[PDB]
Amino acid sequence: MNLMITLLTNFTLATLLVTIAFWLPQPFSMKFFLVAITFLLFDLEIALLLPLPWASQTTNLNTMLTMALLLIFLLAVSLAYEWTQKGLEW
Amino acid sequence: MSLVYMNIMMAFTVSLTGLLMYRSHLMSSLLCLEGMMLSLFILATLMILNSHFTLASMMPIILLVFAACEAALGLSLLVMVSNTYGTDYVQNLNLLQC
Amino acid sequence: MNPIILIIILMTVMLGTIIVMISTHWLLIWIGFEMNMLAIIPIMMKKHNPRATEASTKYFLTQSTASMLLMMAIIINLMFSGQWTVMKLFNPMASMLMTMALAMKLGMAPFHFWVPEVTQGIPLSSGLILLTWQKLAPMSVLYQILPSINLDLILTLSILSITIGGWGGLNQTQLRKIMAYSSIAHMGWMTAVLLYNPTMTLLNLIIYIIMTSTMFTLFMANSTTTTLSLSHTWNKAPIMTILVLITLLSMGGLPPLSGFMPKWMIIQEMTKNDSIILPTLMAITALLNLYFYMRLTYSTALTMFPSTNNMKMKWQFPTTKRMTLLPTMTVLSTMLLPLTPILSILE
Amino acid sequence: NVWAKEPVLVASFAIAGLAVILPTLSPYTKYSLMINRATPYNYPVPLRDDGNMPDVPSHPQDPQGPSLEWLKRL
Amino acid sequence: PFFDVQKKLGVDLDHWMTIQSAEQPHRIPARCHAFEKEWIECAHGIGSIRAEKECKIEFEDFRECLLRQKTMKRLNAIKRQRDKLIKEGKYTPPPHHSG
Amino acid sequence: LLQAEKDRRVLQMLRENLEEEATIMKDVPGWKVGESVFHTTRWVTPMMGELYGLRTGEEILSSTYGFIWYT
Amino acid sequence: MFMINVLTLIIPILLAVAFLTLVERKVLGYMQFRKGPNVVGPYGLLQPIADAIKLFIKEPLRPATSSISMFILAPILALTLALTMWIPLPMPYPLINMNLGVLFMLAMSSLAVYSILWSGWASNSKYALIGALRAVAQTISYEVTLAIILLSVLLMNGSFTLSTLIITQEQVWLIFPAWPLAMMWFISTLAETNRAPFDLTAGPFALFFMAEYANIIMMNIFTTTLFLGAFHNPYMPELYTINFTIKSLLLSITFLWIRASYPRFRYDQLMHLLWKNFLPLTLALCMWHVSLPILLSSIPPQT
Amino acid sequence: MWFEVLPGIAVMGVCLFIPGMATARIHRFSNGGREKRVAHYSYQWYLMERDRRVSGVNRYYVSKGLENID
Amino acid sequence: MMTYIVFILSIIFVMGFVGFSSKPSPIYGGLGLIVSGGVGCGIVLNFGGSFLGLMVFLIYLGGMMVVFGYTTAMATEQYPSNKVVLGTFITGLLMEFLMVYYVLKDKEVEIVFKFNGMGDWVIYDTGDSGFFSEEAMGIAALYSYGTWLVIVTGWSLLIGVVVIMEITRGN
Amino acid sequence: PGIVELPSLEDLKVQEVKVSSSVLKAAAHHYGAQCDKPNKEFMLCRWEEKDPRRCLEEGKLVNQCALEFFRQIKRHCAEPFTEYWTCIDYSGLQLFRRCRKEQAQFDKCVLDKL
């Protein structure tokens, strides 16, 4: 409840800022869309990667090393696939 | 029985009715599917946390990443629909009659 | 399309259905259903006409809500007795949601609205792969979760599915809708006998998938959508006529031909339990789903329509398609009557 | 050659290849495994004294157990 | 068909994910470890239906370990009886902070 | 030492709380004083309402949810 | 006491942001051949005070739009991020100890992306929508790089808690075992501040103003904690606090010093630059920072 | 020269110097010349809970030094 | 501001789910889903709660409603409230009030279950010697034991990339 | 079902260590070396029978071993041990790498005199 009270105080102070600021002075491109989903899939593979340092202390290191490098290898494979198959070109 | 479980199940069924009935836009339907996804996420994660089921805690993050990529595919298909038509309605789908 | 990419996508169809087959864990079956969905979508929209876009859209929405409802059933299963063993459940509510999820998956009469709509506006390769694998994959799941199903669920879905898939097709002249309604009726058949012996269910699964592959290969030999094209393929090639004759009369399930071996063994291991009025009702519906087969046969090779010319031109060039494997599948699908103790090759 | 075409790609190939291949010859993998196994989280439960075991020392001062000195000597 | 390549190739690849009582990599038990182990040792070499006919008691004890249904039932009943009798007004309470 | 004082204090809470339970319910039918609902007879971990129940909010809010938001 | 700590955090954000604006204008003026603002009163601190209170009590930019609710709701999000995103940053005794703070940093950056998107949808006709859309895309194209680089530098010291990081920076600075990874992270912070060499070519400008400048000071404080610093001695924290402030001020002067010197990019050249120059090099340095501590007998004491 | 920019940098650095200084001052005041016990793990929270249990003043910075052995 | 704080945040959670189940304009739905995700993260962190809710906060409220608002920006228009939407939000408010009423002024609520309706501080750990925050080593077990699992997950993500680009005009 | 077999308040009375946790962690090694030999009987009792209500007597025994250890460290050197734990106390959580000097002083104290 500590950080919730801090969040509440900051929200109330910001709303007081807005009320003093206001009540007191009285088509597309398809090539845009590939950025969002490509970011989304890179960020999902980030979500797969990022609990890696918690696993840095167990009795399995070779299998973990090989599969983690396999995951970044596959991320680079997807990168090279869209990189060579005009997925991000202009 | 942890009465909050009943609330998240009722929230699931609310989001399911929001998925099923939808008038005009498909974006509201797909967004209620995402809310239903959030519901299953919260329900499973609270169960596994409070039960101290520490071994197979893969479920929240895996359900997360997979139904997220499903939502990404659905948004891509909706972009294809709105590109080949004027709107993205349940209307203008009267072709391919049954 | 690129053939490397289609080899990878076929590899993922195989991978997803094998993962559904093999795993003892519920999460992996859910991921297998999702990967099967993600792979079966780009085989559809093989062209770019908006028929394919709308059909793949309807299909993806129904399959996504099916996967969500199945994950709901699994987490309810762990709200009750909690273990990740894919076996007998511990809730009529979880079993209810799971059977309704699989019934939205493979199609039943409350849930059959998407099947002709997705099978109409797609090319034939997509219809082939989706009918074969999307009617093969959840039957392993049903084979694993058979001990804890309320019978009123399966029975209501199966009765109503056979009679609705029979009642459809009397008005439609698209061949894909005919095949879709036939698929819905046979899914009712292959689910109806599940709670008594699953051997009949998986054997009928293999036999109907062989029949569907024969049907789609005989419609890949000639680009056809209406029966008028079938009359023109009567006039341009003689063997396709008698093949449509024999394969359609095996779809009808008549005794000297091998389409009757599934229904008859179902009648045996259904009426050894003293349900009688339900099997004879189901087999009256098996009479009922044959009239559109019969008028189809009348359109193909029994009554002969006048054909427009330029088939005069088509007489020079051979029917130079490729077939995956047509004759082996045909003679496995037709003359397989006296191999009735080869029931037990599956069990 | 390709050294001036896209050089950061070439440097990426080189450092990635050495990151892959490099764990073959280096003397420290066994040291990492011994350090990681030599960290107790679970409490070592004492057991019933003897089924005639010529190990499992009763006093932790006794150097008869699975010991360590190289923890201090790098 | 429930294939068994899991036990055919000799690779236990997907059984660590299954229940508790397998080796967590930092070995801690959950709330209902021993109930799982006694229910499994009750119903191991059993044909899955006389398991329901015989292992019912330890299964119900497993369920009351997990959900704690009737335990919360009795505790809520004690709460409601305490609430109504102290609304009636007996013993200005000495359970808090002392005996 | 921590484990020993942990066990002694939780048995102390069991003894005091079941003594107060045996005080409070001399009205309703049924109700034996300490019959657990568990059919088998082993020591079970209490559910943190068996120990910290009927303490009127403040002490149980300090004890249970203390570490979850203690800064 | 608790709210006293809250107020002594969140009252000098006004003073710090306004005086950052005077300092950045003076440093632009002396990188240029200028004085000023110095004629208005003593040396121009009252000049940020006076134009801040003017820009408060200027007329509200009246819609001329719709969706008053979303017009309220986007900058309230931006400034509550600005106020709630200095809290877990440890200058030695932080306001809230956390098991994890760095993924909280990334999540609040994504909430700033939400703020930009909401203001863009509630903005105007189609051209402002397309401009805000491209701004959202160039903002979102860096939470891959920043996230993975921050992951690979916390991998050198294990815990997410970041107080273990300020422990481990006692012996040598972290710029020495990662100089190129730190340089790429600093360029990603230049991207996330959305300043030069990047583009903006309205209202409430006071709140958007405050949000961007608090984001700048946040990234500078998180940089000064993240990649450099010195030892912290207990029972004398003001020494480390002064050294912290000196290093963060010189790094913010370095930030503005690089800002005043180069023209902008091209957008397709920007995405070309981003993907085809950062992203294989990020992956390469990250996989080398995975394979190296497993081979130097040094897995961190992430307890 | 750059003599004019330095008082603005100085006052803005004082505004950067103030919040952590005042925060560490308040933490050393509201514990009695201590650093506050950071609570990362359930083990150290149980240790801090038995610390606040043995104090009796319903706080933890009292630390009851050695004059209650027997 | 009382003991049932998890129940209160759950009431606000179902409020947000109803608030976008009423089918608004899709960016208002995205706003309701963002408030729903924030309070769901709050709930799961209140039950302790180390990593998972802050993990989903980057994913859904860091990388999914971004794409929701993105597609709402680029595709749909709303180029010119309704009685059905406001009436459905009234029904959601009233059914929440009815469920909370049957919790508070009765014993319990049973739909087809037995929900013991009281404060959800039970059940909870009795302060065991964790020392490593068992969620953390739990998610660390995904790399110690996860041979098959990360392979099929990353393989599906590669398929996600190639499927997205093919459907949106590969190559 | 089964009734409970709880130990009454007759067995719920052993005088405990009325010491702070700071000094308790500060004297970890020497309490774990000289004493904590017969409490492995308690740990073996606990891990052979996971049944508190049975193994309480060796809990009383480890309590009295802690009492005897604290008397043996109280009446002899060191009184600078008090300075040692109040040196380690205000350094956040008690790292053993902070107050090294008085740690060595206490080491040479207890080595030369006890």
Asked if J59 and J17 touch (Cβ cutoff 8 Å), the reply is no
Copy the structure tokens of residue C64. Answer: 């996504």
Domain I2-168 belongs to what topology? Answer: Four Helix Bundle (Hemerythrin (Met), subunit A) (1.20.120)
Residues 76-135 of I with CB under 8 A from E: 107-108, 114, 116-118, 122-123, 130, 132, 134
Q: Which residues contact C334 (CB under 8 A, 6 or more apart)?
A: C246, C247, C250, C257, C258
The one-letter amino acid code at J60 reads K
Q: Considering only CB atoms, which chain G residues are within 8 Å of A24? A: 57
Question: Phi and psi of C150, rounded to 5°?
Answer: -65, 130
DSSP reduced 3-state for I109 = strand
Sign, CA torsion J65/J67/J68/J72: positive
Domain boundaries, chain J: 1-114
Residue boundaries of the structural domains of chain I: 2-168
Distance between CA atoms of residues G35 and G43, nearest Å = 10
Q: What's the burial of D15, exposed, middle or buried (CB within 10 Å: 0-12/13-18/19+)?
A: middle
Asked if I134's CB is within 8 angstroms of E28's CB, the reply is: yes
Cβ(C209)–Cβ(C132) under 8 Å? Answer: yes
Which chain J residues in 77-106 lie under 8 Å from chain H, judged by CB atoms? 82, 85-86, 89-93
Which residues of D have a CB under 8 Å from any CB of E? Answer: 41-42
> Chain H window 1-60: which residues touch F at a Cβ cutoff of 8 Å?
36, 38-39, 42, 45-47, 49-50
Q: Look up the domain containing H43 and give its range.
A: 1-70
Show the 3-state SS of G105-129. HHHHHHHHHHHHHHHHHCCCCHHHH
Determine whether the interchain pair I159/C28 forms a contact, defined as Cβ–Cβ distance below 8 Å: no
- Asked if F53's CB is within 8 angstroms of E57's CB, the reply is no
* Contacting residues for C273 by C-beta, under 8 A, at least 6 apart: C196
Cα gap E74→G205, rounded to integer Å = 60
Residue tagged 């808090």 (tokens) = E96
Helices G2-10 and G12-31 sit at what angle, rounded to 10 degrees?
Answer: 20
Domain B1-86 has CATH 3.40.630.10: no
Residues of H within 8 A of G99 (CB-CB) are: 40
Query: What is the rounded distance in angstroms from the CA atom of residue B69 to the CA atom of residue G54?
Result: 48
Residue of I nearest to A78 (CA): I158
State which H helix or E strand residue C78 sits in. helix C50-79
d(CA J10, CA E54): 41
> Token digits for B77?
């298909």
Whether B69 and A44 lie within 8 Å, measured CB to CB: yes
- Chain F residue with CA closest to I119: the answer is F49
Q: Which chains touch J (3 or more CB pairs under 8 A)?
A: D, F, G, H
- Residue I46 Cα to chain centre, angstroms: 14
The rounded distance, in Å, linking the Cα atoms of J86 and C118 is: 77
| Nearest CB neighbour to F4, from listed J12, J24, J59 | J59
Delineate the domains of chain A, giving CATH numbers in brackets. Answer: 1-85 (1.20.58.1610)
Q: 3-state DSSP call for residue I115?
A: strand
I and F adjacent (3 or more CB pairs under 8 angstroms):
yes
Q: Is omega for the bond preceding G37 within 30 degrees of 0, making it cis?
A: yes
Token pair, residue G115, equals 């703020």
Widest distance between CA atoms in chain G: 64
Mutate to test the interface with J, among D47, D56, D62 (most CBs of J within 10 A): D47
- The answer to whether D27 contacts chain A (CB < 8 Å) is no
- Distance in angstroms (rounded) separating the CA atoms of residues E41 and E38: 5
Number of B–E residue contacts, CB under 8 Å: 26
Which residues touch H1 (CB under 8 Å, ≥6 apart)?
none
Cα distance between residue B45 and residue B52, in whole Å: 11
Query: Cβ contacts (< 8 Å) between I51 and chain H: which residues?
Result: none
Using a 10 angstrom Cβ sphere, with 0-12 exposed, 13-18 middle and 19 or more buried, the burial of residue F71 is middle
Q: Are C198 and C143 in contact (CB under 8 A)?
A: yes
Distance CA G142, CA G278 (A): 10
Distance CA A52, CA F58 (A): 40
* CB contact burial J69-83 (16+ within 10 A = b; e otherwise): bbeebeeeebeebee
Q: Do the Cβ atoms of B53 and I139 come closer than 8 Å?
A: no
DSSP letter for J4, please.
P
Domains of chain B, by residue range, sit at: 1-86
DSSP secondary structure, chain F, as one string: -HHHHHHHHHHHHHHHHHHHHHHHTSSSSS--SS--S-SS-------SSSSS-SSTTHHHHHHTSTTTS--
Q: Tell me the C-alpha distance between G282 and G148, whole Å.
A: 8
> How many domains does one find in chain H?
1
**D–A contact (≥3 CB pairs within 8 Å)?**
yes
What's the half-sphere exposure (Cβ side, CA atoms, 13 Å) at I112?
5
Q: After which residues is chain A broken (C to N over 2.5 A)?
A: 26
Chain I residue with the nearest C-alpha to that of F51: I126
CA-CA-CA-CA torsion sign (C216, C221, C224, C228): negative
Structure tokens at G217: 């000071």
Query: CB contact, 8 Å: D28 with chain G?
Result: yes
Query: What number of C-beta contacts closer than 8 Å exist between F and J?
Result: 63
Comparing alpha-carbon positions, the chain J residue that sits nearest to H66 is: J19
Q: What share of residues in chain H are helix, strand, coil (percent, to 5)?
A: 55, 0, 45
Q: What resolution in angstroms does the PDB record give?
A: 4.4
D-J C-beta contacts closer than 8 Å: 13
Structure tokens at D11: 């440097």
- From chain A, the residues in CB contact with B65 under 8 A are 44, 47-48
| Entry field: residues in chain A | 90
Pair E19, E36: CB distance under 8 Å: yes
Kindly report the nearest CA distance between residue A37 and chain D, in angstroms: 24
Q: Chain A contact for D44, CB < 8 A?
A: no
The closest of A54, A80, A53, A35 to G286, measured between CA atoms, is A53
State how far the Cα of G72 lies from the Cα of A15, in Å rounded to an integer. Answer: 9
Chain H closest-CA separation from residue I11 CA (Å): 29
CA distance I112 to chain C (A): 9
State both tokens at A36. Answer: 């969002």
- F45 CA to centre of own chain: 10
Phi, psi of G112 (to 5 degrees): -65, -35
Listed in sequence order, the residues at least 6 apart from D52 whose beta carbon sits closer than 8 Å to its beta carbon are: none
- Give the span between the Cα atoms of G228 and B61, in whole angstroms: 33
The 10 Å Cβ neighbour count of residue I57 is: 22
Contact H70 J23 (CB under 8 A): no
| Minimum Cα–Cα distance from F7: chain I residue | I126
Whether cis (ω within 30° of 0) applies to the bond prior to J78 is yes
Tokens describing residue C22: 């093999």
Residue H60 to residue H35: CA distance in whole angstroms: 12
Q: Do H41 and I132 touch (CB under 8 A)?
A: yes
Q: What one-letter code names the amino acid at F7?
A: D
Q: What is the DSSP string of chain G?
A: -HHHHHHHHHSHHHHHHHHHHHHHHHHHHHHTT---S-TTTTTSSHHHHHHHHHHHSSPP---SSS-HHHHHHHHHHHHHHHHTTSSSS-SSS-SS--S--HHHHHHHHHHHHHHHHHHHHTT-SHHHHHHHHHHHHHHHTTTTHHHHHHHHHHTTT--SSSHHHHHHTTSS-TTTT-SHHHHHHHHHHHHHTT-TTS------HHHHHHHHHHHHHHHHHHHHHHT------TT-HHHHHHHHHHHHHHHHHHHHHHHTT-----HHHHHHHIIIIIHHHHHHHHHHHHHTTTTTT------
Q: How far is CA C174 from CA C116, C292, G13, in A?
A: 10, 11, 71
Technique behind the model: cryo-EM
For the four alpha carbons of G238, G243, G248 and G250, in that order, the dihedral sign comes to positive
Cα–Cα distance, A33 to G137 (Å, whole number): 9
Rounded to whole angstroms, the maximal C-alpha distance in chain E is 71
Whether D38 has its CB under 8 Å from any CB of chain A: the answer is no
Please name which of C79, C74, C75 lies closest in space to residue C145, comparing C-alpha atoms: C74
Query: How far is H13 from H10, CA to CA, in rounded Å?
Result: 5
DSSP string, C25-49: SHHHHHHHHHHHHHHHHHHS-SS--
Q: Which two tokens stand for residue G215?
A: 């984001």
> What residue of E is the nearest CA neighbor of F21?
E78
Q: Do E72 and I122 touch (CB under 8 A)?
A: yes
